Curated annotation (Swiss-Prot):
Effect of residue 47 to S: In schizoaffective disorder
Result of changing residue 79 to I: In CJD; uncertain significance
Summary of subunit composition and partner proteins: Monomer and homodimer. Has a tendency to aggregate into amyloid fibrils containing a cross-beta spine, formed by a steric zipper of superposed beta-strands. Soluble oligomers may represent an intermediate stage on the path to fibril formation. Copper binding may promote oligomerization. Interacts with GRB2, APP, ERI3/PRNPIP and SYN1. Mislocalized cytosolically exposed PrP interacts with MGRN1; this interaction alters MGRN1 subcellular location and causes lysosomal enlargement. Interacts with KIAA1191. Interacts with ADGRG6.
Origin superkingdom: Eukaryota
Species this protein is from: Homo sapiens (Human)
Name of the molecule in the record: Major prion protein
Protein family: Belongs to the prion family.
Effect of residue 59 to A: In SENF and early-onset dementia; induces loss of glycosylation at N-57
Involvement in disorder: PrP is found in high quantity in the brain of humans and animals infected with neurodegenerative diseases known as transmissible spongiform encephalopathies or prion diseases, like: Creutzfeldt-Jakob disease (CJD), fatal familial insomnia (FFI), Gerstmann-Straussler disease (GSD), Huntington disease-like type 1 (HDL1) and kuru in humans; scrapie in sheep and goat; bovine spongiform encephalopathy (BSE) in cattle; transmissible mink encephalopathy (TME); chronic wasting disease (CWD) of mule deer and elk; feline spongiform encephalopathy (FSE) in cats and exotic ungulate encephalopathy (EUE) in nyala and greater kudu.
Record: glycosylation sites: 57, 73
Free-text comment on this protein's domains from its UniProt entry: The normal, monomeric form, PRPN(C), has a mainly alpha-helical structure. Misfolding of this form produces a disease-associated, protease-resistant form, PRPN (Sc), accompanied by a large increase of the beta-sheet content and formation of amyloid fibrils. These fibrils consist of a cross-beta spine, formed by a steric zipper of superposed beta-strands. Disease mutations may favor intermolecular contacts via short beta strands, and may thereby trigger oligomerization.
Disulfide bonds: 55-90
Amino acid sequence: LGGYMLGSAMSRPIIHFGSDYEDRYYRENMHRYPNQVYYRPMDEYSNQNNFVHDCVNITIKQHTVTTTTKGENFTETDVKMMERVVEQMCITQYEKESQAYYQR
């Protein structure tokens, strides 16, 4: 966390995996997953998935670590469901300042 920020929530997205089962599983148990993602300003690694994967892994880690506190682990399914969400948020965060940076 040594030099990041918490810039916006972007509610709780819905991301239709392609299985009615997962689509319920998430819609029940979404609250354990995030509604905000940490990130940094553009300092290298800023184009397609580069920036997104870095902030994703931090926020998926922050969830991991919040649940090593409570006495849980997110199994890899929950983690992959989180990654869908945490990516969708961070892509939106790229689509703010970086789009002004590439405006001129």
